Amino acid sequence: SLSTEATAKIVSEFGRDANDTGSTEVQVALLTAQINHLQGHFAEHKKDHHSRRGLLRMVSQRRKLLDYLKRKDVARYTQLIERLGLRR
Amino acid sequence: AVVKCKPTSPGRRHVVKVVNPELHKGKPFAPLLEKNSKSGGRNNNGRITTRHIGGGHKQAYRIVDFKRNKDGIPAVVERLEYDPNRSANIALVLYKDGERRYILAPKGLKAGDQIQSGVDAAIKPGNTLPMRNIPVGSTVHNVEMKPGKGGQLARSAGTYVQIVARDGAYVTLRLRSGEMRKVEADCRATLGEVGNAEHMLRVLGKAGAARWRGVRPTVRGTAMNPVDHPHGGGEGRNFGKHPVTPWGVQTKGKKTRSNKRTDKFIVRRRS
Amino acid sequence: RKQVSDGVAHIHASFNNTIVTITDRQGNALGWATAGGSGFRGSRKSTPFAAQVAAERCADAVKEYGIKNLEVMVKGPGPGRESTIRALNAAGFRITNITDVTPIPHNGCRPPKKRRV
Amino acid sequence: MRHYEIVFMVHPDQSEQVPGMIERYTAAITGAEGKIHRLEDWGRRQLAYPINKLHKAHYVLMNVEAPQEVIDELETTFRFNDAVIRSMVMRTKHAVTEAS
Amino acid sequence: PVIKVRENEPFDVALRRFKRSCEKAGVLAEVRRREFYEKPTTERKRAKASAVKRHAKKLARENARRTRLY
Amino acid sequence: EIDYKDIATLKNYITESGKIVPSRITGTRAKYQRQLARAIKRARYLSLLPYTDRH
RNA sequence: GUUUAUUAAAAACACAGCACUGUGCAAACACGAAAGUGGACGUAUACGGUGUGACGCCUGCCCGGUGCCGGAAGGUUAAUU
RNA sequence: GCUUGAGUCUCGUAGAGGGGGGUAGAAUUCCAGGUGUAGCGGUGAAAUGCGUAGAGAUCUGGAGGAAUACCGGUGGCGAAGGCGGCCCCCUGGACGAAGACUGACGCUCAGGUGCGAAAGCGUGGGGAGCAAACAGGAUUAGAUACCCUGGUAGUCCACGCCGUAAACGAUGUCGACUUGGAGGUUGUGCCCUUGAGGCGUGGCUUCCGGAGCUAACGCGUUAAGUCGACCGCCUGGGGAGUA
Ligand SMILES: [Mg+2]
Ligand SMILES: [Mg+2]
Ligand SMILES: [Mg+2]
Ligand SMILES: [Mg+2]
Ligand SMILES: [Mg+2]
Ligand SMILES: [Mg+2]
Ligand SMILES: [Mg+2]
Ligand SMILES: [Mg+2]
Ligand SMILES: [Mg+2]
Ligand SMILES: [Mg+2]
Ligand SMILES: [Mg+2]
Ligand SMILES: [Mg+2]
Ligand SMILES: [Mg+2]
Ligand SMILES: [Mg+2]
Ligand SMILES: [Mg+2]
Ligand SMILES: [Mg+2]
Ligand SMILES: [Mg+2]
Ligand SMILES: [Mg+2]
Ligand SMILES: [Mg+2]
Ligand SMILES: [Mg+2]
């Protein structure tokens, strides 16, 4: 999946502290971290449909989580997308 | 890549092009060029020796290093450029001593890649080594028939030669035509296939396209009169003859090779 | 002529015909006998008896070589699988080792389709 | 940077070069910050079945820990080295140093 | 299947070893299996029937042993 | 856990003709049989064990 | 697009495409008593010959005859002896 | 607001999950050569076919393709289709252990989008075996079949298209509740010397059965029982899944 050390940076960078792992920001950031990393995989493994099914689940989960943030706090949502450079 | 033209007009509907963005868009390397003139199929007697040759775009020959005798000096691929004289492209390489040369572009070569020629060179595409040192079963191109004479086999766009056996001083090669041939192990070969494998997927699309590359129209023997061609005429469309060449030799099946000198090296014919 | 003392016997047992051949340790054939050529045709050759008779004819075809030791190679199924080997006792031939060499593919080639009998 | 187990058999006529090859291969990994956890020269052993009309081969064991490239670039050398025949590599999760 | 016969072993026992060694390996059964193609569907169906028979056989036997017949 | 190099124990789970003995006979657990088979196939490749009695 | 300059411009020729077949490079082939030249400063994704003639759906049966290809144990068979 | 739904993180586990690359052995066919001689092959029987131009059989060597015996198991994994040699690289999902974190972020889903056996189509390769079509020999009153000897497409690979199956568990997805017995498979806690043990706790899964349900057959904690949410679909047979 994702390297343990790389996961540690995101939870600290986006979370309030190093122990808050459930925050919607780290989940979205964690999902985004894996989503973009798989572009290289599917760049040449175009017919690897079975693992792509898992990728679309990550995309769907990220969409669902982002919509939740929009309803809860719009200002906080805007900061997350601009930092992550998504919703283009 | 292969691109199908949109049918904006007749003569363009069926045209399929091969586009390689990596090819150099500028002028070739001037000091490595020379002038070659069209012959039109005429020999030194002026007679038409081979038919259906004439016209076409002007072309300038470029000295392609088919020997690759620069041993021990690494070179870097400066760029790939179009070659009007052959189906394959040519990669311009710069030896670090300051000498430039043209070589046939292998399958995967690109600008900046490392290429080395010699007996101790690494086993990578684009490297030239004697087949004595090349492992058996490896795909090679631009194979010399004689040591030091320069490559003469697998020079086309996507052609290649497979080294199948190595017995003593001779190596048996599976030629692209399917025939197996014996060559000395001292002859040099270049690792990897020839580049631009899509050259066979292009479609000229229109009659003028063939003319651009110096191919004049071919006239069938059936439409001839008896005086001109053995197939002759006849009121209506009558053939009633075994197909033959315009000089009477039977075609469509008749074996023609008669070289008793080198049939020793032909372990097996193509079919 | 060669006067080899040790030989190798190959049993090509099959559902239709049984072939018995005798060869030296190097696989060079010395003599052979078959059920079909021993006066049995059609269903006759398929029976186990034809296998034992074919073995008898094989012994005479090689008696001039004066072989003593034999290797019984067995291939394929059939009623002649066991009858032929026992027939060598009637000839008194001596054997040293017996092994099964029936081809057993690890999948691979496409077997022929079933017969709708 | 994972644990690897390497086994390779060389031509019996090249039994006098095996100490040399071990040093060269070990040097390559150690140059990339790797370290060898086990080395064993099993000697010439009887083959279960012939390979290329050959019945006896020299066996050695090499369990190492090094990055991707050095083993990947080591595999290609294994391919063209005619002395070595039928080499194998494996993946392991923990370094093991047993006699076996 | 390989069997080694000594000089002092009588043939009767030696012959039976072939009938008990080769047959144990299943040469006569394996060869018949590849004589004709059982299509993949047939393999699963026949295996399914055998599995049902194997399980049902023990169930049928176990119940019968606990049931009197006279 | 089962190591292909542990060659002394491998004949206990193969026949003379190279057959792998089924679990129903040897009584080995299903998990161990799976890894055992991998070890056997691994050893056969290295010419440590024979594929069959004919070679 | 081409053609009977001067009674025929067309359904004829050509054509991109398709297929068969020859050719391992001192290539086949072609012009030359020969040297040599072209094919080609190309190398089977190349070249020559032949038929068909964009594209679409397709191209069935017959190898006795003729031709070609392969083999050739046997029969017959030249110069020579 | 809250933590029990759902989700995140740490540590491990099993697995033909998927894509790419490499490699190994057995076997068939073909090619070369040696030994050797008149049959081989095939069927209920026979013939076509192959063979004195030396087959089949047997040995040695080489080329090439396809599939992975034993393991192997109502065993495993996957949403389904489906996925079996071994090795490496990239990667999806599930499950367990306790602990922490977010705090309803959930369920279903017309249209839509994606995947989707085999056959089939397009282009370029490959082609050992098998085998529609086709050919011949049998069988029969006839045999455009069943059987036999040959045999092309196809079966294989690259990329695109096709989007159909008894694509079945003939049973849509999610959640809760309701007596049991015997197994398989994969985690885990505890007792521990009285182990190829003893008592618990999860996931998946096979068979038999209670109440209940059902037209009956049967289903039966993996419901076809008792309920809730949402969607799909049916309205006599034929005509017709046709115009
Ligand atoms: Mg995840
Ligand atoms: Mg021409
Ligand atoms: Mg033409
Ligand atoms: Mg005319
Ligand atoms: Mg007419
Ligand atoms: Mg048959
Ligand atoms: Mg006029
Ligand atoms: Mg006019
Ligand atoms: Mg015409
Ligand atoms: Mg026709
Ligand atoms: Mg829908
Ligand atoms: Mg298909
Ligand atoms: Mg196709
Ligand atoms: Mg048939
Ligand atoms: Mg349907
Ligand atoms: Mg199915
Ligand atoms: Mg079913
Ligand atoms: Mg249905
Ligand atoms: Mg029940
Ligand atoms: Mg319709």
Domain-located, residue E61:
no
Experimental method: cryo-EM
Number of folded domains in chain D?
Answer: 1
Chain C residues 16-45, Cβ below 7 A from strand H: 16-17, 19, 21, 23, 26-32, 34-37, 41-43, 45
Q: First CA to last CA across chain B, in angstroms? A: 33
> What is the distance, to the nearest Å, from the Cα of residue B255 to the centroid of all Cα atoms in its chain?
24
* Nearest nucleotide relative to A10: CA against C1': H9
Which residue type, as a one-letter code, is found at position B88? A
Interacting residues of D9 by C-beta distance below 8 A, sequence separation 6+:
D57, D58, D59, D84, D85, D86, D87, F46, F47
Distance A56 CA to H233 C1' (A): 30
Domain-located, residue E62:
no
Catalogue the long-range contacts made by F30-36 (C-beta closer than 8 Å, 24 or more residues apart).
Answer: F32/F1, F32/F2, F35/F1, F35/F2, F36/F2
CA dihedral B51, B57, B59, B64 (to 10 degrees): -70
Chain A residues 47-76, Cβ below 7 A from strand H: 47-51, 53-55, 57-58, 61, 64-65, 67-68, 71-72
Domain-located, residue E30:
yes
Residue linked to tokens 């194997």: E54
Q: What range defines the domain where residue C10 resides?
A: 2-117
Closest of C105, F51, C101 to residue D48, by C-alpha: F51
Q: Which two tokens mark D87?
A: 């080499």
The rounded distance, in Å, linking the Cα atoms of C51 and C79 is: 8
Task: Write down all domains in chain B, each with its CATH number in brackets.
Answer: 1-113 (2.40.50.140), 117-194 (no CATH), 195-271 (4.10.950.10)
- The runs of H, that is alpha helices, within C30-115 are 43-46, 48-62, 80-91
For chain D, helix (H) and strand (E) counts, in that order, are 2, 4
The rounded distance, in Å, linking the Cα atoms of B140 and B160 is: 6
Torsion angles phi and psi, residue B236, rounded to 5: 85, -155
Q: What range defines the domain where residue E12 resides?
A: 1-56
The rounded distance, in Å, linking the Cα atoms of D25 and C73 is: 48
| Residues of chain F with C-beta less than 8 angstroms from the C-beta of E1 | 16-17, 53
Please state, as a whole number, how many other Cβ atoms lie within 10 Å of the Cβ of residue B23. 15
| Residues of chain C with C-beta less than 8 angstroms from the C-beta of E16 | none
Interacting residues of A55 by C-beta distance below 8 A, sequence separation 6+:
A35, A38, A42
Angle between helices D68-80 and D18-31 in degrees, nearest 10: 150
Chain C residues 44-103, Cβ below 7 A from strand H: 45-46, 73, 75, 101, 103
Number of folded domains in chain E?
Answer: 1
Residue linked to tokens 């372990």: B267
Longest dimension (CA), chain B: 72
Torsion angles phi and psi, residue B123, rounded to 5: -90, 85
Domain-located, residue D86:
yes
Interacting residues of A85 by C-beta distance below 8 A, sequence separation 6+:
none
The rounded distance, in Å, linking the Cα atoms of D77 and D82 is: 10
Q: What range defines the domain where residue D57 resides?
A: 1-92
Q: CA separation (Å) from B74 to B99, B100, B112, B122, B186? A: 11, 12, 12, 11, 21
Q: CA separation (Å) from D47 to A75, C101, D85, D89, F48? A: 73, 21, 12, 19, 6
* C99–F53 CB contact, under 8 Å: yes
The rounded distance, in Å, linking the Cα atoms of C102 and B45 is: 72
Torsion angles phi and psi, residue C100, rounded to 5: -100, 125
Whether there are 3 or more C-beta pairs closer than 8 Å between B and D is: yes
Domain-located, residue E3:
yes
Whether there are 3 or more C-beta pairs closer than 8 Å between D and F is: yes
The rounded distance, in Å, linking the Cα atoms of C57 and B139 is: 55
Closest of A23, A28, A33, A27 to residue A1, by C-alpha: A33
Interacting residues of C84 by C-beta distance below 8 A, sequence separation 6+:
C11, C13, C18, C20, C51, C52, C54, C55
* E25–F15 CB contact, under 8 Å: yes
Number of folded domains in chain C?
Answer: 1
Domain-located, residue D19:
yes
The rounded distance, in Å, linking the Cα atoms of B49 and B40 is: 9
Contact in structure between D92 and D63 (CB atoms under 8 Å): yes
> What is the distance, to the nearest Å, from the Cα of residue B203 to the centroid of all Cα atoms in its chain?
18
Q: Which two tokens mark B80?
A: 């790939």
Residue linked to tokens 């089962």: F2
At how many Å resolution was this determined?
2.5
The rounded distance, in Å, linking the Cα atoms of D78 and D72 is: 10
Q: Which two tokens mark A28?
A: 């979205």
| CB-closest option in F3, F5, F47 to D48 | F47
Side-chain half-sphere exposure of A42, counting CA atoms within 13 A: 16
**CA of residue A29 to ligand 1 center, whole Å:** 12
The rounded distance, in Å, linking the Cα atoms of A37 and A1 is: 10
Domain-located, residue E68:
no
